[PDB]
Amino acid sequence: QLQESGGGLVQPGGSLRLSCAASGFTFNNYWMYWVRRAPGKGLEWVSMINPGGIITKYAESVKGRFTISRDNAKNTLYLQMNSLTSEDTAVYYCAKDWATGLAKKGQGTQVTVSS
């Protein structure tokens, strides 16, 4: 079980933090990912973090602007998004086992960046 929240309408230059509550697996044992689907487009990974939360990697389009983090005690994943631009408009999803046949993601949360 993965359920994203925190999406909304934000003015360009604004900040937003998304959340994903995880259950039904051993959260602290898994790499976790944020991916997004922009209007008309395929899914595009954005961020990933290792089990202990000390290794992260970001897509070039969000480096310097987004921070992924996790709370293993709460089984929650976070995406801090700053300096949002129209091109960040998308449904964001948290995913386990991304890029494998075991890949699973939530129903997603809509982020609209609009002036």
Partner: protein, 159 residues
């Protein structure tokens, strides 16, 4: 001898490490161990993705539109790239798709990392007809806390 080194995802997709949703320090270590003290030849997209010379190696960039950067050697042709390496035992070709294509017919050895990740990439690694190559080394690793996906190293030598 000329060798190619590449990371191939499911279906032999290749692309730029910074565009891939994997984190594989074990593969970075394998790449460093096999390329250190050797010249490395790459195309312009690979150079632009790395953004700086790979340290501990002679960097040679093969492109039709040469560069501003005095830390590396810019060449216009396969033969120029080879000459630029000078008197060395082993030349490492580290990609681009188009670059792997140009050097594979000249290559005697392939160092591959096979990654258990289905990803979008630039292209695929060129056909390496099974019967022209023999696998001389092979090692499988699971994903762990440091490496996001499982991977297998392999070295093949030309028959």
């Amino acid at each position: 001898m000329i060798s190619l080194i590449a990371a191939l995802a499911v279906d032999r997709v290749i692309g730029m490490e910074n565009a891939m949703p994997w984190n594989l320090p074990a593969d970075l270590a394998w790449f460093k161990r096999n390329t250190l003290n050797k010249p490395v030849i790459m195309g312009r997209h690979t150079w632009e993705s790395i953004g700086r010379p790979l340290p501990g190696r002679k960097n040679i960039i093969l492109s039709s539109q040469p560069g501003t950067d005095d830390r590396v050697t810019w060449v216009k042709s396969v033969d120029e790239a080879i000459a630029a390496c000078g008197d060395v035992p082993e030349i490492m070709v580290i990609g681009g798709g188009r670059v792997y294509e140009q050097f594979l017919p000249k290559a005697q050895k392939l160092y591959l990392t096979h990654i258990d990740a289905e990803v979008e990439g630039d292209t695929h690694f060129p056909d390496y007809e099974p019967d022209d190559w023999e696998s001389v080394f092979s090692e499988f690793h699971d994903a762990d806390a440091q490496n996001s996906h499982s991977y297998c190293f392999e070295i093949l030598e030309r028959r």
